[PDB]
């Protein structure tokens, strides 16, 4: 390798977005600033389209890359990337939830985002602390049944019930009213940061953020959900964080994304760093770590590939083995992978919203 | 000077589902009606897919667009390729007529591009739920061929989630459901729902039968709409309870000839196997041709419909396509698969499914599910 080139597919907006582009640039600058220079070629996705993602992959492969990162928030498209990466034997580095299918693509990818099973287990751990009550689940879309499959199977067998409602409309109010009528305390919200905020804002207006109710959010952007006027002194609103605020680069990461936001986005208030930005940063380090390790025992070369040819990257299988041996301390905590390419030996901090922000009330361990 | 549509097939030439023949039968029937003045002749250009791949499917669409078509039909059994066709049809504003199960999860931006003659997931779930009602709402086991069955059967799953009855879910490992079936056997729950295609459903029932699990205790409900072609000779006994659905209207005036024509083809070209009866996808393809012709002739009674070559690499759209979608969604047609009508989302509406039980003599009709009731 003359340069250590990888590609990143971004579905992030440039203005008032999650700062994934800057996070990639920060990782690159940090690694290079410390041989072959690291390059990250960035490709934009306008929407979640498998057909258009295929066109993007056909542009990427001829550039000679060692991995493809993302996208973080376009599940159909990410499944297409995994498929094509698998056929070409180029590693796919995932940084968002799979929503949520594929047995045959077992060795196409690794993912830095918590597995669906782990999120299900983490929510179930909280339900255990509640003495396993019946609950309601509010989903942005019906695919939540796939991502929370393990939780759903548990409720399908238990004595406790789970009432599921989909937003699929832009006002949760009527849905919350039905929950209130049911007189069930525990409400699980499965949605991204902005919809989660919308649901809680409307619950607040209906007086449903009082002490009677207990909310569990699945979004890993819980830390950047700022809930003033929504969160009451008596609220029980719990969620998760992957961030290791003790990682040496954490303050610099926060400040850099803050400055970028202040400069380009005057219409909204910077809430703090999005997890997908931190995952992108960590993904660059994971790829570089594995490639440099592989490069110690054998000769790596990159080659232009065509998406429609039968040709593969001869070194891809080996790189995937080295990726799955990586042990890395990142912004999102310890990064190690199991034989499915899922994060293992990591933690999720369990946070509760308070007046001033949030406080840590516990830790979930993947092991 | 003609009303030309294209059909994309993933079906074998011989010993297959008979889709190519069904398309020719629809065209012959429509062109055979005597009208004065003589109306435009119907043509169906047929393209075969050697595989379920965006690359091949895109190439096929690129061959189709310059031919000047008013709609593209199928493929029936390749959801990934069907989604590729929807994408390209949608960009060029040519209606896509779907005749197989929807991709699950659905790609939202492509919903507008098609109408579908195959029952929605919601409808399949409701029909299964209707059978469960007749068993007095029992606990059940669900056997899934694909990880997406919980989404396909969302209504049914949400129902079990608030019910006092339980649902155990087991996914098949991409060629022996035996271990899975032994687990169900130990649970001592009678009702087993199988969500799988025809060949995998047959495999599950065969392995169940080899475990002695097709005796009277067990009650099976199959989601496959090809239930009628499932031949379980040596698997089903008088005492078995194996239930499923049929879309076919055997009282449609062309039904006997449709079946005989597909049979004759089979007894000409497949001296090995025994003709199992008509595949649903073949009947859906037949009905799809009628639906397209009906909508196009109605659109054409006010506007002069022109058809020019388009191309994959050109941004040109067919100027009548978006309007044709409105007419397609308003078609009412009595077909081989029953009443064909659509709701505003392009899904089948106002139709029925027959509820059948397998017997040694084939199967027996035991009820009806009404989509509206
Ligand atoms: C969070 O998820 C919501 C709900 O799925 C997304 O909101 C949709 O966005 C599309 C495209 O902008 C709109 O056409 C829909 O009207 C929205 N639905 C609803 C219910 O609001 C939203 O895109 C996601 N937020 C982010 C930042 O990714
Ligand atoms: C019914 O489903 C099964 C798989 O779910 C299909 O069988 C597949 O056939 C091809 C060719 O051998 C392979 O890609 C898969 O490995 C097979 N799976 C299994 C388990 O056999 C079968 O083709 C489907 N039938 C139709 C017409 O859709
Ligand atoms: C691979 O090894 C060679 C020799 O040690 C070195 O020149 C090259 O920069 C290495 N590549 C990377 C990415 O470290
Ligand atoms: C952004 O930076 C400013 C200036 O230091 C600070 O006041 C603000 O709180 C920062 N935002 C976050 C969320 O850290
Ligand atoms: C966070 O980073 C610090 C500093 O490197 C490290 O000591 C600690 O183990 C990390 N914590 C977690 C939860 O990974
Ligand atoms: C898990 O990660 C920690 C760092 O957070 C590391 O010290 C430890 O060796 C790992 N434990 C196991 C069992 O792999
Ligand atoms: C449209 O109507 C005109 C007038 O009868 C006729 O020439 C033509 O056959 C029709 N076109 C189609 C495709 O039905
Ligand atoms: C197919 O043809 C055979 C031989 O002519 C006939 O006996 C049989 O009834 C037909 N099968 C069906 C399902 O119509
Ligand atoms: C079946 O076809 C007959 C004859 O055209 C028709 O009267 C009847 O309504 C149809 N039944 C269904 C269920 O569509
Ligand atoms: C639904 O279909 C039936 C049976 O073919 C038909 O007679 C009727 O007009 C339709 N009903 C409604 C409410 O449109
Ligand atoms: Na339950
Ligand atoms: Na239940």
Swiss-Prot record, chain B:
Q: Which residues lie on this side of the membrane: Extracellular?
A: 1-373
Top-level division of the source organism's lineage: Eukaryota
Question: Which pairs are disulfide-linked?
Answer: 15-270, 62-312, 144-149
The entry's function note states:
Ionotropic glutamate receptor that functions as a cation-permeable ligand-gated ion channel, gated by L-glutamate and the glutamatergic agonist kainic acid. Cannot form functional channels on its own and produces channel activity only in heteromeric assembly with GRIK1, GRIK2 and GRIK3 subunits.
Glycosylated residues in this chain: 197, 249, 263, 300, 350, 372
Please give the name of this protein: Glutamate receptor ionotropic, kainate 5
Subunit structure of this chain's protein: Homotetramer. Heterotetramer with GRIK2. Can form functional heteromeric receptors with GRIK1, GRIK2 and GRIK3.
State the tissue distribution. High expression in the cerebral cortex, pyriform cortex, caudate-putamen, hippocampal complex, medial habenulata and granule cell layer of the cerebellum. Weak expression in globus pallidus, thalamus, colliculi and the reticular thalamic nucleus. Expressed at high levels in the trigeminal ganglion neurons.
Q: Which family does it belong to?
A: Belongs to the glutamate-gated ion channel (TC 1.A.10.1) family. GRIK5 subfamily.
UniProt lists the gene as Grik5
Compartment(s): Cell membrane; Postsynaptic cell membrane; Presynaptic cell membrane
The species is Rattus norvegicus
């Amino acid at each position: 390798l003359s340069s250590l080139r990888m590609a990143a597919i971004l579905d992030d907006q440039t203005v008032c977005g999650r700062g994934e582009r800057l996070a990639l640039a920060l990782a690159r600058e940090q690694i290079n600033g410390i041989k072959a220079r690291v390059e990250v070629d960035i490709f934009e996705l306008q929407r979640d389209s498998q057909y258009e993602t295929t066109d993007t992959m056909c542009q990427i492969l001829p550039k000679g890359v060692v991995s493809v990162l993302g996208p973080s928030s376009s599940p159909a498209s990410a499944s297409t990337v995994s498929h094509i990466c698998g056929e070409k034997e180029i590693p796919h580095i995932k940084v968002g939830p799979e929503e949520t299918p594929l047995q045959y693509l077992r060795f196409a990818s690794v993912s830095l985002y918590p597995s669906n099973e782990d999120v299900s287990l983490a929510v179930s751990r909280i339900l255990k602390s509640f003495n396993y009550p019946s609950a309601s689940l509010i989903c942005a879309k019906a695919e939540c049944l796939l991502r929370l499959e393990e939780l759903v199977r548990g409720f399908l067998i238990s004595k406790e019930t789970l009432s599921v409602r989909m937003l699929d409309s832009r006002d949760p109010t009527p849905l919350l009213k039905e929950i209130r009528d049911d007189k069930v305390s525990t409400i699980i919200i499965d949605a991204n940061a902005s919809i989660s905020h919308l649901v809680l804002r409307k619950a607040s207006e209906l007086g449903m953020t009082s002490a009677f109710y207990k909310y569990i959010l699945t979004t890993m952007d819980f830390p950047i959900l700022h809930l003033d006027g929504i969160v009451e002194d008596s609220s029980n609103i719990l969620g998760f964080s992957m961030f290791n605020t003790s990682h040496p680069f954490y303050p610099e990461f926060v400040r850099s994304l803050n400055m970028s936001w202040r400069e380009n986005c005057e219409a909204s208030t910077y809430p703090g760093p999005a997890l997908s930005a931190a995952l992108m940063f960590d993904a660059v380090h994971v790829v570089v770590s594995a490639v440099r390790e592989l490069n110690r025992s054998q000769e790596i070369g990159v080659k232009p590939l065509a998406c429609t040819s039968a040709n593969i990257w001869p070194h891809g299988t080996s790189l995937m083995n080295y990726l799955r041996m990586v042990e890395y301390d990142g912004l999102t905590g310890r990064v190690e992978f199991n034989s499915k390419g899922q994060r293992t030996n990591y933690t999720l901090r369990i946070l509760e919203k308070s007046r001033q922000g949030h406080r840590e009330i516990g830790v979930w361990y993947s092991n």
